Write a protein that binds this ligand. Structure first.
Ligand SMILES: NC(=O)c1ccc[n+]([C@@H]2O[C@H](COP(=O)([O-])OP(=O)(O)OC[C@H]3O[C@@H](n4cnc5c(N)ncnc54)[C@H](OP(=O)(O)O)[C@@H]3O)[C@@H](O)[C@H]2O)c1
Ligand SMILES: [Cl-]
Ligand SMILES: [Cl-]
Ligand SMILES: [Cl-]
Ligand SMILES: [Cl-]
Ligand SMILES: [Cl-]
Ligand SMILES: [Cl-]
Ligand SMILES: [Cl-]
Ligand SMILES: [Cl-]
Ligand SMILES: [K+]
Ligand SMILES: [K+]
Ligand SMILES: [K+]
Ligand SMILES: [K+]
Ligand SMILES: [K+]
Length: 324
């Protein structure tokens, strides 16, 4: 079984980059689109022999999409709002993959539209992906949809919104967010675990996974449990503080601000599930949201491992020195 060529977009993003590194390591050639060739990650991927980068915007650039899928047999597509009209781009990519005629398994990274499951607003950077998912489903090629849990590495002590592990004057850390302190949230070590899981889906094949939604989360932890993991990892006091509104301490694009306001309503006010879809006596065993992901990849890393082994390095690389 010669490893098939995988087409991917937004290659410098955490999800795609995770897949590209391990896919290339096991023999897959990769055709990857990047908005630009500069940057540490783009440079890193360009140096991988099995990888070929195609620089250019996706917005209104079907020709680049046709080039990307040329000769590819598999695809992993994860769009971002930074590239622009996510729905238009997601549909254009799906169409280009079908037109290539060689795509045997198309994995699209989707997210929920909360407004379909309760008296909740749609989270703006998530709902559009669900529209693309519906469109992909009606295309004549096998497709699978993965839903990413919250990234372990969203955490930083820099003053960025929602996931700031704030370093206090006394050396302790505090994480302030709207999430209920005790409701478990789905987490994901994006860099280490997205790739391996995706590869297993491709290995399993389209017959087993066509039409399926898979939650890419390997651990559920309430905010209090997250802080306890950081505390054990760093041997420091780390405490969770539930706040009504997201503390926005830096300037952000308006689209992100609307995303955060939706999060305050969805999670702060309504305590709705992160994955609101329905699917997410003796011997009767109900499936946990982490079941399929763990079956796909047993080598996943938890929050405590991230906090102890990676967080200190990412923090130092960002110039912080609490770990010095
Ligand atoms: N973080 C979470 O907890 C979480 C959970 C579930 C789903 N998601 C979804 O994940 C998606 C993001 O994917 P990701 O995590 O793999 O990416 P990511 O790591 O957040 O990286 C974002 C990327 O977009 C690039 N970029 C910057 N400006 C751009 C522009 N104007 N046009 C095109 N690309 C541009 C950046 O490249 P350079 O910096 O190299 O230029 C970077 O590679 C989002 O749609 C988000 O909703 C996130
Ligand atoms: Cl293969
Ligand atoms: Cl190639
Ligand atoms: Cl990119
Ligand atoms: Cl047909
Ligand atoms: Cl701060
Ligand atoms: Cl706490
Ligand atoms: Cl700012
Ligand atoms: Cl959930
Ligand atoms: K290369
Ligand atoms: K509704
Ligand atoms: K399909
Ligand atoms: K069709
Ligand atoms: K996703």
């Amino acid at each position: 079984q010669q490893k098939k060529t995988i087409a991917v977009v937004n290659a410098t993003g955490r999800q795609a980059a995770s897949l590209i590194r391990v896919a290339a390591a096991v023999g897959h050639h990769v055709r990857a689109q990047v908005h630009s060739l500069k940057g540490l990650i783009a440079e890193e991927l360009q140096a991988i022999p099995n990888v070929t980068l195609f620089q250019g915007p996706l917005l209104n650039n079907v020709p680049l999409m046709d080039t990307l899928f040329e000769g590819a047999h598999l695809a992993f597509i994860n769009t971002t709002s930074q590239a622009g009209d996510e729905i238009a781009i997601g549909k254009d990519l799906a169409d280009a993959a079908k037109r290539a005629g060689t795509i045997q398994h198309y994995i699209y990274s989707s997210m929920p539209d909360h407004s379909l499951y309760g008296p909740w607003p749609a989270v703006p950077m998530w709902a559009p992906k669900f529209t693309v998912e519906n469109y992909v489903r009606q295309l004549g090629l096998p497709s699978t949809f993965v839903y990413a849990g919250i990234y372990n590495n969203n955490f930083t002590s820099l003053p960025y919104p929602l996931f700031q592990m704030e370093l206090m004057p006394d050396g302790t850390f505090e994480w302030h967010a709207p999430f209920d302190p005790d409701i478990p949230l789905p987490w994901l070590d994006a860099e280490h675990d997205v790739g391996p899981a995706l590869l297993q889906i491709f290995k399993d094949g389209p017959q087993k996974w066509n039409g399926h939604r898979i939650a890419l989360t390997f651990e559920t932890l309430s905010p209090v449990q997250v802080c306890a993991a950081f505390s054990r990892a760093l041997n420091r006091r780390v405490t969770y503080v539930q706040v009504p509104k997201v503390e926005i301490k830096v300037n952000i694009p308006v689209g992100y601000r609307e995303q955060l306001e939706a999060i305050e309503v969805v999670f702060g006010e309504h305590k709705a599930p992160y994955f609101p879809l329905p699917e997410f006596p003796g011997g009767v065993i109900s499936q946990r949201v982490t079941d399929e992901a763990r079956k796909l990849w047993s080598g996943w890393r938890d929050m405590e491992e991230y906090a102890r082994e990676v967080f200190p390095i990412e923090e130092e690389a960002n110039g912080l020195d609490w770990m010095l």
